C-alpha cells in the first residue's frame, strides 16, 4: 500500500564449528533501521537510521531481549526440523522467517502477512485473513496443526492489525524526513556504438526514492519489448536506489526510440531522447 | 517495534 | 506443572535461604515475585534464556542463578532488609506471554 | 504512575448482582490483556485472557478491551460467594519483551 514495516530473520547451521548464525534486519519502505547479527560485536539490537537512534535504553533492551531469544527458538526449530525429514547433522540447513503489515493512505491497516521457509522453499504461511494456514508439505502440517491448538494466529493477527501500524505512524511522524519523502529520478541517456549498423540506447534513471520504478520503451508511440535488456533496481548505498534500461537501435534513427520513467515523484512519466 | 517471541515450530 | 518447595519455610535472621522452583511446561522464561500483605507483586529476578537472569525492581538481598532449563532457585541473603513476604515463581514461554504461578512459599525471618 | 494501574480499593458486590471491576496501563506497546484470580493466602489464578476490542464471553465472566482509551475490564455476572478475592490485571509490553502486573482490587461479594 501506502507504507509498509517489515522484519527479516535469517539462521544458517554451521554444523562442527558452531552454534546457528542468527541475523535480523527491519525495514520500513526501503529504509532499513535496525539489525542484528550474532557474529557481530554489540550483540545488541544496533539502530541503522537516524530517527530511531531516539529510542528509550528500554526499546533497545526489548528488542535485543527478542532476537536473544528469537535465535534460541530457530536453534530448537533447525533441530526439530531435520528429524521431519530425517536429515543428518552434517548437512547444513537455514531458516527464514518475516512478517509485516502494510497500510493505506489513512495510515490504518491495510494487509498483514506472515511466513516461513526452510531451506529456500515456502513452509507455512499466514493467510490474508490473518486467521489460517497454507501448509506446504506433510512436515508443514504437523506445526500447523501444533500452531492451530495453540492458537498462534489469534496473537499473530494483533502484531499486524495492531502494534504494527501503531509502531510504523509512529516511525513515519519520527522520521518525517526520511519515510516520507519522495525523491524524483535523475534520468539521463547515453549512446555507445555497437557496430557500423547497430547501436545501443540505455536510459538511465539515478537518485530515485522509494525503489518502485518502471521503465518502459516506445517507438514512433508504440511499446517495444523485443531488442530491449531491463536490469533489476539497484542499491545506491546513499539510501537511494539506481536502475537503467537499453535497447539496441539501427544507427540513424533513434530519434524515433524514446524513453519512459515512472515513479512515485513524477506525476506525469518522464520521457528520455538522445537528441 | 518486533513481534512477541515466536512460537517453536 | 511448576511447583515450589515448601509451602510454609521460617528462618532465623542472618543466614541464607534457597526457595526452590522446578518447572515441567519446557517453558523458556521463569520469575520470581514478593507478595507482602496488601501491596501486591514486585519482581525480585527474571531470566528468559537457559543462562541469562536479568535483575528486577527490587533485587536488593536476592541472588538467584537459573544453571539450567528447568529450575529458578532463588536465594534470599541476609543484605535483604524485609525477607518476611509471599514469594511466588512464574514461567512463561516468552517474556510477553501469560505467565502461570506456583503454589507459593511464605518465608519469616524474625529477630 | 505504574504502568498497569487499578483502583485497589475494595469493592463490593451484592450477591446476584453484575461486578465491574476496572483496569487501565499505560501503552508499552500493549498487545495481550489478562485477568488473574487470587484467593487469601493462594497463587493467582489464570482466569481471561483478550487479545483485539469487544468482548470475550466464558463462564459467569466476560473482558472488554478497548485499546483506542487504555482500559480492560472484567464483568461477573451471578456473584457467588466463591467469587471473593483480589483479581489482578495482567497487560504485556512489547517496549521490553516485559510483563506488568496491577497491584490487584479485592472484590467482596456480599450476601
Known amino acids: 500500500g501506502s507504507h509498509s514495516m517489515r522484519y527479516f530473520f535469517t539462521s544458517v547451521s554451521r554444523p562442527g564449528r558452531g552454534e546457528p548464525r542468527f541475523i535480523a534486519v527491519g525495514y520500513v519502505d526501503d529504509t532499513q533501521f535496525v539489525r542484528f547479527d550474532s557474529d557481530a560485536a554489540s550483540q545488541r539490537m544496533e539502530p541503522r537510521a537516524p530517527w530511531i537512534e531516539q529510542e528509550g535504553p528500554e526499546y533497545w533492551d526489548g528488542e535485543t531481549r527478542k532476537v536473544k531469544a528469537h535465535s534460541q527458538t530457530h536453534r530448537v526449530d533447525l533441530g526439530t526440523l531435520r528429524g521431519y525429514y530425517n536429515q543428518s547433522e552434517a548437512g547444513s540447513h537455514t531458516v527464514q522467517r518475516m512478517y509485516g503489515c502494510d497500510v493505506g493512505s489513512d495510515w490504518r491497516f491495510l494487509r498483514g502477512y506472515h511466513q516461513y521457509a526452510y531451506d529456500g522453499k515456502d513452509y507455512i504461511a499466514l493467510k490474508e485473513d490473518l486467521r489460517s494456514w497454507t501448509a506446504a508439505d506433510m512436515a508443514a502440517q504437523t506445526t500447523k496443526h501444533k500452531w492451530e491448538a495453540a492458537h498462534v494466529a489469534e496473537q499473530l493477527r494483533a502484531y499486524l492489525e495492531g502494534t504494527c501500524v501503531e509502531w510504523l505512524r509512529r516511525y513515519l511522524e519520527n522520521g518525517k524526513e526520511t519515510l516520507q519523502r519522495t525523491d524524483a529520478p535523475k534520468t539521463h541517456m547515453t549512446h555507445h556504438a555497437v557496430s557500423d549498423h547497430e547501436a545501443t540506447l540505455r536510459c538511465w534513471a539515478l537518485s530515485f526514492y522509494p525503489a518502485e520504478i518502471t521503465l518502459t520503451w516506445q517507438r514512433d508511440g508504440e511499446d517495444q519489448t523485443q531488442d530491449t535488456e531491463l536490469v533489476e533496481t539497484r542499491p545506491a548505498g546513499d539510501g537511494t536506489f539506481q536502475k537503467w534500461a537499453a535497447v539496441v537501435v539501427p544507427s540513424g534513427q533513434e530519434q524515433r526510440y524514446t524513453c519512459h520513467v515512472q515513479h512515485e515523484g513524477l506525476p506525469k512519466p518522464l520521457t528520455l531522447r538522445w537528441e | 517495534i518486533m513481534d512477541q517471541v515466536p512460537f517453536s515450530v | 506443572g511448576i511447583t515450589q518447595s515448601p509451602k510454609y519455610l521460617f528462618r532465623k535472621e542472618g543466614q541464607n535461604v534457597t526457595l526452590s522452583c522446578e518447572q515441567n511446561?519446557?517453558?523458556?522464561?521463569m520469575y520470581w515475585y514478593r507478595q507482602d500483605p496488601g501491596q501486591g507483586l514486585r519482581l525480585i529476578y527474571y531470566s528468559q534464556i537457559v543462562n541469562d537472569f536479568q535483575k528486577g525492581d527490587i533485587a536488593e538481598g536476592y541472588s538467584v542463578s537459573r544453571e539450567k532449563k528447568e529450575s529458578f532457585p532463588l536465594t534470599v541473603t541476609s543484605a535483604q532488609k524485609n525477607p518476611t513476604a509471599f514469594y511466588l515463581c512464574?514461567?512463561?514461554?516468552?517474556?510477553?506471554?501469560?505467565?502461570?504461578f506456583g503454589p507459593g512459599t511464605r518465608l519469616t525471618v524474625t529477630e | 504512575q505504574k504502568e498497569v494501574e487499578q483502583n485497589s480499593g475494595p469493592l463490593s458486590v451484592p450477591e446476584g448482582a453484575i461486578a465491574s471491576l476496572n483496569c487501565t496501563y499505560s501503552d508499552r506497546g500493549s498487545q495481550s490483556f489478562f485477568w488473574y484470580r487470587q484467593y487469601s493466602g493462594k497463587s493467582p489464578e489464570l482466569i481471561m485472557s483478550?487479545?483485539?476490542?469487544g468482548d470475550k464471553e466464558d463462564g459467569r465472566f466476560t473482558a472488554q478491551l478497548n485499546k483506542a482509551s487504555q482500559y480492560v475490564s472484567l464483568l461477573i455476572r451471578d456473584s457467588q460467594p466463591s467469587d471473593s478475592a483480589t483479581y489482578l490485571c495482567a497487560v504485556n509490553a512489547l517496549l521490553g519483551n516485559q510483563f506488568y502486573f496491577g497491584t490487584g482490587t479485592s472484590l467482596t461479594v456480599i450476601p
Open positions: 512464574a514461567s512463561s514461554m516468552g517474556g510477553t506471554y501469560e505467565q502461570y
Open positions: 483478550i487479545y483485539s476490542n
Open positions: 511446561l519446557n517453558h523458556d522464561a
